[PDB]
Design an enzyme around this catalytic site. Sequence first.
Site, PDB file in Angstrom:
ATOM      1  N   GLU A  71       0.806  -1.222   0.000  1.00 20.99           N
ATOM      2  CA  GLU A  71       0.000   0.000   0.000  1.00 20.99           C
ATOM      3  C   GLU A  71       0.844   1.280   0.000  1.00 20.99           C
ATOM      4  O   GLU A  71       1.072   1.886   1.066  1.00 20.99           O
ATOM      5  CB  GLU A  71      -0.950   0.033   1.203  1.00 20.99           C
ATOM      6  CG  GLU A  71      -2.162  -0.864   1.030  1.00 20.99           C
ATOM      7  CD  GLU A  71      -3.182  -0.816   2.145  1.00 20.99           C
ATOM      8  OE1 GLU A  71      -2.963  -0.212   3.215  1.00 20.99           O
ATOM      9  OE2 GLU A  71      -4.223  -1.466   1.990  1.00 20.99           O
ATOM     10  N   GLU A 123      -6.046  -7.440  -0.815  1.00 24.13           N
ATOM     11  CA  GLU A 123      -6.455  -7.197   0.574  1.00 24.13           C
ATOM     12  C   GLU A 123      -7.797  -6.495   0.651  1.00 24.13           C
ATOM     13  O   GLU A 123      -7.981  -5.446   0.036  1.00 24.13           O
ATOM     14  CB  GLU A 123      -5.410  -6.332   1.303  1.00 24.13           C
ATOM     15  CG  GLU A 123      -5.570  -6.307   2.816  1.00 24.13           C
ATOM     16  CD  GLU A 123      -4.545  -5.456   3.535  1.00 24.13           C
ATOM     17  OE1 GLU A 123      -3.336  -5.730   3.392  1.00 24.13           O
ATOM     18  OE2 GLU A 123      -4.964  -4.546   4.295  1.00 24.13           O
TER      19      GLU A 123
END
Length: 305
Positions: free
Chosen positions: A140, A228
Amino acid sequence: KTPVAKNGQLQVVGTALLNRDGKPFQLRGISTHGLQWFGQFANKDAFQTLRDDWKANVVRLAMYTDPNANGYIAQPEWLKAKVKEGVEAAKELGMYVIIDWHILNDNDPNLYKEQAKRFFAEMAREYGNTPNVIYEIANEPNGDVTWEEKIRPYADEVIRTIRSIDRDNLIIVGTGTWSQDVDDVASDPLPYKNIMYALHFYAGTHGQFLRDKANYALSKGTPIFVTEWGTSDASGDGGVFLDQSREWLKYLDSKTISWVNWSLCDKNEASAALRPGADPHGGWGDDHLSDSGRFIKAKLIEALE
Ligand SMILES: [Ca+2]
């Protein structure tokens, strides 16, 4: 027959993930929480329960990088050993397995780029010879860290390293704003074999606005993989959001987009799939599945159906 025995070496064509026969193929499974904190669940016995009973066909090994989180930069050999145990377990069970370079507070992947290159080169030399391993090179990116300015340059160098060794196993690259900004990739995509781009969401936080961004990306040819997602909200204080989760999974299934839930641990938080005290070695009765875990297990079983 195991997922890898049935599907073999996966390929990316346009937006689509295909199996060895050119058939559309969806991976569905669950991620560990950080291996430095909840690594006890990253073992062949937990994974066999996921394969045999939950009907997952992929697991994700979340290797935090940030040394302040006790990530790889603080303790590289100890975390690498956990990753190897996880990959070996997945190989033995014929499951696909994502090795996740789990950046987060270290919000620019360039900070540890040299370490990332060496790590992934090692993983590719060890595991690049069978279909199982998937390389997730930057969980991320977030903050002022854009595709053109920071993420793509990082990805291009790491992908060249990996592809010099492993020509074909899937590489998944994170996107801006905690892997939301998939719509920025098509402006300068990566010209390598078998690359996909990460989309992450929480059912209690993100909705149609983020699905529109995904659709825009898809419309320009960008392949998406959800490495995710959570059933709670971004903070985790809302409980679980199962109807919103169902809506998201309907969307992903409609686009044959692969997905990985967060997370397989027993932390006392809404997104955790297990209740406190759940056995690290699997075989979890209903008493030790959380509301989120009960839903994920049922959805995985239903999908195989
Ligand atoms: Ca390979």
